[PDB]
Amino acid sequence: LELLSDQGYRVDGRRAGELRKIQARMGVFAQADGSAYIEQGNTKALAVVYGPHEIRGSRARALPDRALVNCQYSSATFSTGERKRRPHGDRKSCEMGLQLRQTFEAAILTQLHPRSQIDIYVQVLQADGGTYAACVNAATLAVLDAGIPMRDFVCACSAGFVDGTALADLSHVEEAAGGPQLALALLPASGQIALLEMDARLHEDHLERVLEAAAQAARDVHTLLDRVVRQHVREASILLG
């Protein structure tokens, strides 16, 4: 086992600056107002967005100014090789919920749907590294499929640091090694970050590198996603007339 061969290659067979082929789709479930699917390698996220609809049991939380974003996270038991139970209610899925919520409340441009729930839901079927970013991106595609206004593709990805270099879009192996991994989600058009999570020890001068690397990886993810979205829109319009 190893992470960076002296030549520059990884285990999976890709250099540091590149990533794995995302293969996506938009329109999985029709009984909803917006759905998506994404596989950013072996990972397999699945998003759903029940649109801006009425609040029931008002319970005096229907914001009158803006809309009410309610995003729920879930990591299936059979996601990891080690089976686990209680995927919801845990102290980690709820943190992921907070994160997704504060991202999309930033992006989703709620000032136009006051007193209304935008219900986002995310289920992770398979996890092999980069488990948050796949979900961010799937929920983005979902939102778009639901014609919900939103400032920009909020594209996310992860970076890491090994042997004085920066890796893009980590997997589980180098994610388990314990090295610093920095996940983020930004809005490309403006160059602004909507989220910045990070967990491990490393020096400071080695920050700009992984930071810009994650940013560029997110730009690439943006390219791929937007090509998908354009194919989808084109096909739909053609079928309309």
Partner 1 sequence: MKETPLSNCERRFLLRAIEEKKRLDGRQTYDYRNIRISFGTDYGCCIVELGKTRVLGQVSCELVSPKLNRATEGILFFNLELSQMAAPAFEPGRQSDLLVKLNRLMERCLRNSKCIDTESLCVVAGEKVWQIRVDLHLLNHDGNIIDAASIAAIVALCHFRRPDVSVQGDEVTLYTPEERDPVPLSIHHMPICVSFAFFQQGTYLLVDPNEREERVMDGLLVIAMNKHREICTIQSSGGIMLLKDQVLRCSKIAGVKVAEITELILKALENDQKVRKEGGKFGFAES
Closest CA to 117 of 191, 33, 181: 33
Contact 49, 143 (CB under 8 A): yes
Residue 40 binding partner 1, by CB under 8 A? no
Q: What binding mask, one character per residue, do residues 102-141 give for partner 1 by CB under 8 A, x or -?
A: xx-xx-----------------------------------
Report the 10 Å Cβ neighbour count for 92.
Answer: 10
**Interacting residues with partner 1 between 163 and 202 (CB under 8 A):** 178, 180, 187, 190-202
Q: How far is the CB of 214 from partner 1 (least distance, A)?
A: 11
Contact 184, 214 (CB under 8 A): yes
Count of residues of this chain found to bind partner 1 when the rule CB under 8 A is applied: 34
Alpha-carbon distance of 136 to 231, in angstroms, equals 20
Alpha-carbon distance of 124 to 145, in angstroms, equals 19
Q: Quick one: 15 or 66, whose CB is closer to partner 1?
A: 66
Alpha-carbon distance of 210 to 163, in angstroms, equals 12
Q: How far is the CB of 137 from partner 1 (least distance, A)?
A: 18
**Interacting residues with partner 1 between 68 and 107 (CB under 8 A):** 91-92, 94-95, 98, 101-103, 105-106
Q: How far is the CB of 179 from partner 1 (least distance, A)?
A: 11
Q: How far is the CB of 57 from partner 1 (least distance, A)?
A: 17
Closest CA to 47 of 30, 69, 28, 22: 28
Contact 48, 118 (CB under 8 A): no
Binding site for partner 1 (CB under 8 A): 91-92, 94-95, 98, 101-103, 105-106, 178, 180, 187, 190-205, 207-208, 211-212, 215
